[PDB]
Design a protein around this motif. Structure first.
Motif, PDB file in Angstrom:
ATOM      1  N   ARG A  17      -1.548   4.326 -11.234  1.00 18.40           N
ATOM      2  CA  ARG A  17      -1.197   5.725 -11.407  1.00 18.40           C
ATOM      3  C   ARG A  17       0.128   6.030 -10.705  1.00 18.40           C
ATOM      4  O   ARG A  17       1.016   6.649 -11.290  1.00 18.40           O
ATOM      5  CB  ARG A  17      -2.286   6.640 -10.847  1.00 18.40           C
ATOM      6  N   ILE A  18       0.219   5.583  -9.462  1.00 20.56           N
ATOM      7  CA  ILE A  18       1.420   5.801  -8.674  1.00 20.56           C
ATOM      8  C   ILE A  18       2.594   5.074  -9.331  1.00 20.56           C
ATOM      9  O   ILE A  18       3.601   5.694  -9.671  1.00 20.56           O
ATOM     10  CB  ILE A  18       1.185   5.399  -7.216  1.00 20.56           C
ATOM     11  N   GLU A  19       2.427   3.769  -9.489  1.00 21.99           N
ATOM     12  CA  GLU A  19       3.461   2.951 -10.100  1.00 21.99           C
ATOM     13  C   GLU A  19       3.936   3.585 -11.408  1.00 21.99           C
ATOM     14  O   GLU A  19       5.132   3.805 -11.598  1.00 21.99           O
ATOM     15  CB  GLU A  19       2.965   1.522 -10.330  1.00 21.99           C
ATOM     16  N   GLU A  20       2.976   3.861 -12.278  1.00 22.40           N
ATOM     17  CA  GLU A  20       3.281   4.465 -13.564  1.00 22.40           C
ATOM     18  C   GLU A  20       3.853   5.871 -13.367  1.00 22.40           C
ATOM     19  O   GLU A  20       4.846   6.234 -13.995  1.00 22.40           O
ATOM     20  CB  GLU A  20       2.043   4.498 -14.463  1.00 22.40           C
ATOM     21  N   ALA A  21       3.201   6.623 -12.493  1.00 20.18           N
ATOM     22  CA  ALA A  21       3.632   7.981 -12.207  1.00 20.18           C
ATOM     23  C   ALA A  21       5.092   7.962 -11.747  1.00 20.18           C
ATOM     24  O   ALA A  21       5.856   8.873 -12.061  1.00 20.18           O
ATOM     25  CB  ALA A  21       2.702   8.603 -11.163  1.00 20.18           C
ATOM     26  N   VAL A  22       5.435   6.913 -11.014  1.00 17.85           N
ATOM     27  CA  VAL A  22       6.788   6.763 -10.509  1.00 17.85           C
ATOM     28  C   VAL A  22       7.720   6.386 -11.663  1.00 17.85           C
ATOM     29  O   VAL A  22       8.730   7.048 -11.893  1.00 17.85           O
ATOM     30  CB  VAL A  22       6.811   5.746  -9.366  1.00 17.85           C
ATOM     31  N   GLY A  23       7.345   5.322 -12.360  1.00 17.37           N
ATOM     32  CA  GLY A  23       8.134   4.849 -13.485  1.00 17.37           C
ATOM     33  C   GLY A  23       8.400   5.979 -14.481  1.00 17.37           C
ATOM     34  O   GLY A  23       9.315   5.886 -15.300  1.00 17.37           O
ATOM     35  N   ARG A  24       7.587   7.019 -14.379  1.00 20.83           N
ATOM     36  CA  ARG A  24       7.723   8.165 -15.262  1.00 20.83           C
ATOM     37  C   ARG A  24       8.929   9.013 -14.849  1.00 20.83           C
ATOM     38  O   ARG A  24       9.429   9.813 -15.638  1.00 20.83           O
ATOM     39  CB  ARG A  24       6.464   9.034 -15.234  1.00 20.83           C
ATOM     40  N   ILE A  25       9.360   8.808 -13.613  1.00 20.84           N
ATOM     41  CA  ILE A  25      10.498   9.542 -13.086  1.00 20.84           C
ATOM     42  C   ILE A  25      11.751   9.172 -13.881  1.00 20.84           C
ATOM     43  O   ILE A  25      12.214   8.034 -13.823  1.00 20.84           O
ATOM     44  CB  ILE A  25      10.634   9.311 -11.581  1.00 20.84           C
ATOM     45  N   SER A  26      12.265  10.155 -14.605  1.00 20.52           N
ATOM     46  CA  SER A  26      13.456   9.947 -15.411  1.00 20.52           C
ATOM     47  C   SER A  26      14.621   9.513 -14.520  1.00 20.52           C
ATOM     48  O   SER A  26      15.323  10.351 -13.957  1.00 20.52           O
ATOM     49  CB  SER A  26      13.825  11.213 -16.187  1.00 20.52           C
ATOM     50  N   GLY A  27      14.792   8.202 -14.420  1.00 21.90           N
ATOM     51  CA  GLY A  27      15.861   7.646 -13.607  1.00 21.90           C
ATOM     52  C   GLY A  27      15.456   6.291 -13.023  1.00 21.90           C
ATOM     53  O   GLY A  27      16.311   5.513 -12.603  1.00 21.90           O
ATOM     54  N   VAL A  28      14.153   6.051 -13.016  1.00 14.17           N
ATOM     55  CA  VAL A  28      13.626   4.802 -12.491  1.00 14.17           C
ATOM     56  C   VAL A  28      13.593   3.757 -13.608  1.00 14.17           C
ATOM     57  O   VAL A  28      13.097   4.027 -14.701  1.00 14.17           O
ATOM     58  CB  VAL A  28      12.255   5.040 -11.854  1.00 14.17           C
ATOM     59  N   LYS A  29      14.127   2.586 -13.295  1.00 11.74           N
ATOM     60  CA  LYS A  29      14.165   1.499 -14.260  1.00 11.74           C
ATOM     61  C   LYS A  29      12.837   0.741 -14.220  1.00 11.74           C
ATOM     62  O   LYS A  29      12.238   0.477 -15.261  1.00 11.74           O
ATOM     63  CB  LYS A  29      15.388   0.612 -14.018  1.00 11.74           C
ATOM     64  N   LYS A  30      12.416   0.413 -13.007  1.00 16.02           N
ATOM     65  CA  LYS A  30      11.170  -0.309 -12.818  1.00 16.02           C
ATOM     66  C   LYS A  30      10.636  -0.039 -11.410  1.00 16.02           C
ATOM     67  O   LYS A  30      11.408   0.035 -10.454  1.00 16.02           O
ATOM     68  CB  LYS A  30      11.359  -1.795 -13.129  1.00 16.02           C
ATOM     69  N   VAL A  31       9.322   0.102 -11.325  1.00 16.81           N
ATOM     70  CA  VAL A  31       8.677   0.362 -10.050  1.00 16.81           C
ATOM     71  C   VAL A  31       7.420  -0.503  -9.932  1.00 16.81           C
ATOM     72  O   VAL A  31       6.806  -0.850 -10.939  1.00 16.81           O
ATOM     73  CB  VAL A  31       8.389   1.858  -9.905  1.00 16.81           C
ATOM     74  N   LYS A  32       7.077  -0.825  -8.694  1.00 17.32           N
ATOM     75  CA  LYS A  32       5.905  -1.643  -8.432  1.00 17.32           C
ATOM     76  C   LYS A  32       5.177  -1.103  -7.198  1.00 17.32           C
ATOM     77  O   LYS A  32       5.712  -0.264  -6.475  1.00 17.32           O
ATOM     78  CB  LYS A  32       6.295  -3.118  -8.319  1.00 17.32           C
ATOM     79  N   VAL A  33       3.968  -1.606  -6.997  1.00 22.82           N
ATOM     80  CA  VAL A  33       3.161  -1.185  -5.864  1.00 22.82           C
ATOM     81  C   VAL A  33       2.398  -2.389  -5.311  1.00 22.82           C
ATOM     82  O   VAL A  33       1.898  -3.215  -6.073  1.00 22.82           O
ATOM     83  CB  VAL A  33       2.244  -0.032  -6.275  1.00 22.82           C
ATOM     84  N   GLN A  34       2.332  -2.453  -3.989  1.00 26.93           N
ATOM     85  CA  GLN A  34       1.638  -3.542  -3.325  1.00 26.93           C
ATOM     86  C   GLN A  34       0.471  -3.003  -2.497  1.00 26.93           C
ATOM     87  O   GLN A  34       0.679  -2.391  -1.449  1.00 26.93           O
ATOM     88  CB  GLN A  34       2.599  -4.356  -2.455  1.00 26.93           C
ATOM     89  N   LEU A  35      -0.731  -3.247  -2.996  1.00 24.40           N
ATOM     90  CA  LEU A  35      -1.932  -2.793  -2.315  1.00 24.40           C
ATOM     91  C   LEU A  35      -2.058  -3.519  -0.975  1.00 24.40           C
ATOM     92  O   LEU A  35      -1.432  -4.556  -0.765  1.00 24.40           O
ATOM     93  CB  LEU A  35      -3.155  -2.954  -3.220  1.00 24.40           C
ATOM     94  N   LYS A  36      -2.872  -2.945  -0.101  1.00 23.17           N
ATOM     95  CA  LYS A  36      -3.089  -3.524   1.214  1.00 23.17           C
ATOM     96  C   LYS A  36      -1.748  -3.640   1.942  1.00 23.17           C
ATOM     97  O   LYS A  36      -1.639  -4.355   2.936  1.00 23.17           O
ATOM     98  CB  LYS A  36      -3.842  -4.851   1.097  1.00 23.17           C
ATOM     99  N   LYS A  37      -0.763  -2.925   1.418  1.00 20.77           N
ATOM    100  CA  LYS A  37       0.565  -2.938   2.007  1.00 20.77           C
ATOM    101  C   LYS A  37       0.951  -1.515   2.414  1.00 20.77           C
ATOM    102  O   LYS A  37       1.617  -1.315   3.430  1.00 20.77           O
ATOM    103  CB  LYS A  37       1.566  -3.599   1.056  1.00 20.77           C
ATOM    104  N   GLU A  38       0.519  -0.562   1.601  1.00 17.14           N
ATOM    105  CA  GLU A  38       0.811   0.836   1.865  1.00 17.14           C
ATOM    106  C   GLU A  38       2.303   1.113   1.668  1.00 17.14           C
ATOM    107  O   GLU A  38       2.914   1.832   2.457  1.00 17.14           O
ATOM    108  CB  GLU A  38       0.361   1.236   3.272  1.00 17.14           C
ATOM    109  N   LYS A  39       2.847   0.527   0.611  1.00 17.20           N
ATOM    110  CA  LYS A  39       4.255   0.700   0.301  1.00 17.20           C
ATOM    111  C   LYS A  39       4.477   0.465  -1.195  1.00 17.20           C
ATOM    112  O   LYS A  39       3.816  -0.379  -1.798  1.00 17.20           O
ATOM    113  CB  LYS A  39       5.116  -0.192   1.198  1.00 17.20           C
ATOM    114  N   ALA A  40       5.409   1.225  -1.749  1.00 17.55           N
ATOM    115  CA  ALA A  40       5.726   1.110  -3.163  1.00 17.55           C
ATOM    116  C   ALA A  40       7.223   0.838  -3.325  1.00 17.55           C
ATOM    117  O   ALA A  40       8.048   1.481  -2.679  1.00 17.55           O
ATOM    118  CB  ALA A  40       5.282   2.380  -3.891  1.00 17.55           C
ATOM    119  N   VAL A  41       7.527  -0.118  -4.191  1.00 14.29           N
ATOM    120  CA  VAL A  41       8.910  -0.484  -4.447  1.00 14.29           C
ATOM    121  C   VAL A  41       9.390   0.215  -5.720  1.00 14.29           C
ATOM    122  O   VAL A  41       8.696   0.210  -6.735  1.00 14.29           O
ATOM    123  CB  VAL A  41       9.045  -2.007  -4.513  1.00 14.29           C
ATOM    124  N   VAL A  42      10.576   0.800  -5.625  1.00 15.17           N
ATOM    125  CA  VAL A  42      11.158   1.501  -6.756  1.00 15.17           C
ATOM    126  C   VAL A  42      12.519   0.885  -7.088  1.00 15.17           C
ATOM    127  O   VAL A  42      13.239   0.446  -6.193  1.00 15.17           O
ATOM    128  CB  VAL A  42      11.236   2.999  -6.459  1.00 15.17           C
TER     129      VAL A  42
END
Length: 68
Positions: A17-42
Motif C-alpha cells: 500500500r505504502i510502496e504503491e501509494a508512494v509510486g502513485r505520487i506524480s513524480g516518483v519513478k520507482k519506490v520500494k519498501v523494506q519490512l523489518k527495516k522501518e524505511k522506504a526507498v523512493v
C-alpha cells in the motif's frame, strides 16, 4: 534517492500500500519498501515532487512516516 522511516506499519499489505501509494505520487519513478527495516526507498526527482511531500502521501495512509 531520498528515503523515509515508517513507524506505523502493520505488515498486512501495508508495505505494498505504502510502496504503491508512494509510486502513485506524480513524480516518483520507482519506490520500494523494506519490512523489518522501518524505511522506504523512493526514486523520484525534486523537479517533479519533493520527498517531504512523498512522506505526506505515506502519512495520508494511516501510519507514521518521516523523511530520513
Amino acid at each position: 534517492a531520498q528515503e523515509f522511516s515508517v513507524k506505523g506499519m502493520s505488515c498486512n499489505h501495508c508495505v505494498a500500500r505504502i510502496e504503491e501509494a508512494v509510486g502513485r505520487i506524480s513524480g516518483v519513478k520507482k519506490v520500494k519498501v523494506q519490512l523489518k527495516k522501518e524505511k522506504a526507498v523512493v526514486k523520484f526527482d525534486e523537479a517533479n515532487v519533493q520527498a517531504t511531500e512523498i512522506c505526506q502521501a505515506i502519512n495520508e495512509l494511516g501510519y507514521q512516516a518521516e523523511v530520513i
